[PDB]
Amino acid sequence: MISLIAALAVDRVIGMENAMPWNLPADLAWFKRNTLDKPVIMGRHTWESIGRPLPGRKNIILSSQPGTDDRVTWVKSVDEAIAACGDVPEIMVIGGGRVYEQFLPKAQKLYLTHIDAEVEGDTHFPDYEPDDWESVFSEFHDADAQNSHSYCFEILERR
Length: 159
Ligand SMILES: NC(=O)c1ccc[n+]([C@@H]2O[C@H](COP(=O)([O-])OP(=O)(O)OC[C@H]3O[C@@H](n4cnc5c(N)ncnc54)[C@H](OP(=O)(O)O)[C@@H]3O)[C@@H](O)[C@H]2O)c1
What we know:
The protein contains 4 helices and 10 strands. It has helices at residues 25-35, 44-50, 78-85, 97-103; strands spanning 2-8, 13-15, 39-43, 58-62, 73-75, 91-93, 109-115, 123-124, 133-141, 151-158. The strands form 2 sheets. It has an 8-stranded mixed beta sheet, sandwiched between helices. It has a two-stranded antiparallel sheet with strand order 2-8. It is globular and about 40 Å long. The two termini are 15 Å apart. Bound molecules: NADP nicotinamide-adenine-dinucleotide phosphate. This is Dihydrofolate reductase.
């Protein structure tokens, strides 16, 4: 199946100027945890921000244009992207905006990081219907020495 994985600040804010407007090492770990040994579909935008494959995962990028790193796989359509995954149990969609927007409808689950920070962004997470999903997990964390904001992990499934 298909899964989305994002970290949202206040107001679904997900990025600014091609970046994540905060720094939460703790999130990094949860992300790795959740994407380890899975294929990951990402947008060219996001790809450019990462700048190198994610070990432990099949990296599939979406671009109209042609590939620019032989180490990762390129694609020109949502169905091909999906194709490229193969017969895997969970495909992970890692953003950016436009991509979330697209796979959203197709998703059966989301993995969220709710971060208590109010920041301006140029990208926000697709609006979804609270009714359609069922929160099956939550895990609160207070700000800390390294994580300057408290945040909460959560997991929803399509109702
Ligand atoms: N907060 C988080 O959880 C999280 C996770 C990821 C990213 N982000 C943030 O996301 C922001 C950028 O997201 P974005 O929406 O600007 O870009 P994106 O989705 O990362 O990149 C979009 C690009 O992907 C290509 N694309 C998308 N759908 C396609 C399709 N069906 N076929 C072909 N190409 C397709 C297009 O590239 P072409 O130019 O090649 O057509 C498009 O310009 C950044 O700020 C990043 O930091 C946040």
